[PDB]
Amino acid sequence: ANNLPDTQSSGPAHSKETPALTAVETGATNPLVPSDTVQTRHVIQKRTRSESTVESFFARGACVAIIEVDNDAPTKRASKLFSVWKITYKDTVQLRRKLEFFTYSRFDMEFTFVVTSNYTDANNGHALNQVYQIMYIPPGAPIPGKWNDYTWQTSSNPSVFYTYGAPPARISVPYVGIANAYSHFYDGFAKVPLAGQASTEGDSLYGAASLNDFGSLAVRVVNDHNPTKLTSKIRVYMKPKHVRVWCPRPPRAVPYYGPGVDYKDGLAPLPEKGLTTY
């Protein structure tokens, strides 16, 4: 967020110093300023880079998931009375691309849950205000098997009970990585296959570290069902905070295809433009 250097007055030049000429082969960028190649006036620079700090770049809540749940009679096998969403930023694209400008990152994370609901039909009465349970299931904790099984006691899991109509729920977590930074890219495997092991052993997905690195969110409607079916969507908004990032990378240029770096479609991003056309 630092200010910018002033432009210094620069007059005619006639000398053996040639800042214009360089050698990009060295791998360095020629740090020229306008006064190196043209005559410049004195300008007291007042612009700053306050809004391009990494913190400012990521200081936005981005939607990373839309978790759909129902409030309906359990006999209705079509309805889904609870939903489990594995935590990740890779279900949407925008925040993913912003994060993947970099190879490593540390940040606290602010989760904000925006809950919307609606009737599905109009001939089965009405509903009282719903309460939603959002339980964090860290890896290894038992995953709910039913909307009302014992796991929802949440004696040790953190849970947020959100009352419909209240302002979106919000919680914060610190940096919870087991490494010293989050790895946006992992060039490796969880397993190394060993010679003599059958083809079904030692095989792991390329670039995946843990089968379950950050656990899940289990969402249900706590209320018992009304005579009419209600559908709800919980939109999850992530905001990195206190961000640090390492090893910048070129941003994604073609559409994402899965959680890896794979690509299948849209491999022609650049449009056509004449070489000598302005």
Partner: protein, 170 residues
């Protein structure tokens, strides 16, 4: 295991040759696969050893469902990972411009999210060499010049001694 590296790319030609190589050291150089299945490249193909691999000019989808290749399909202009090759210069890099230099030297520190990691599971660095300007020489016959990589581990540090790991091959 932990180690930095000194990578030395060697490519000499004559004053009448032309061409340019971009040599990039990419931390966590993940490459795109060749199938509809995500993250499906097998360990053996992801770790080819000294022979390395080659970038391709276009994406070919592996449709052999019975015996999938499970290999990388790294497209050159996508830098093998869905990012425009022109931007790869954000990575530590040098250019071997045959009119100017015949070698590039990259000194890479250990880069990882951990102080030390498993060297068999995880490749900390990738080296990419892309012809930025094609090789050319004033002859009808196709000229060819060799590129030689000479790499020195640096500040090697190892922990957790036991019997030797023998990775599966082929």
């Amino acid at each position: 295991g932990r180690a930095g590296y000194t990578v030395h790319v060697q490519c000499n030609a004559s004053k009448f040759h032309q061409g340019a190589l971009g040599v990039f050291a990419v931390p966590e150089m993940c490459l795109a696969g060749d199938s509809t299945t995500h993250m499906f490249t097998k360990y053996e193909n992801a770790n080819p050893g000294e022979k390395g691999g080659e970038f391709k000019g276009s994406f070919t989808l592996d449709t052999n469902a019975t015996n999938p290749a499970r290999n990388f399909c790294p497209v050159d202009y996508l830098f093998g990972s869905g990012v425009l090759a022109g931007n790869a210069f954000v990575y530590p890099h040098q250019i071997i411009n045959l009119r100017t230099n015949n070698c590039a030297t990259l000194v890479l520190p250990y880069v990882n999210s951990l102080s030390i990691d498993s060297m068999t599971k995880h490749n900390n660095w990738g080296i990419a060499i892309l012809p930025l300007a094609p090789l050319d020489f004033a002859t009808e016959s196709s000229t060819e010049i060799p590129i030689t990589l000479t790499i020195a581990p640096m500040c090697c540090e190892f922990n957790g001694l036991r019997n030797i790991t023998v990775p599966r091959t082929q």
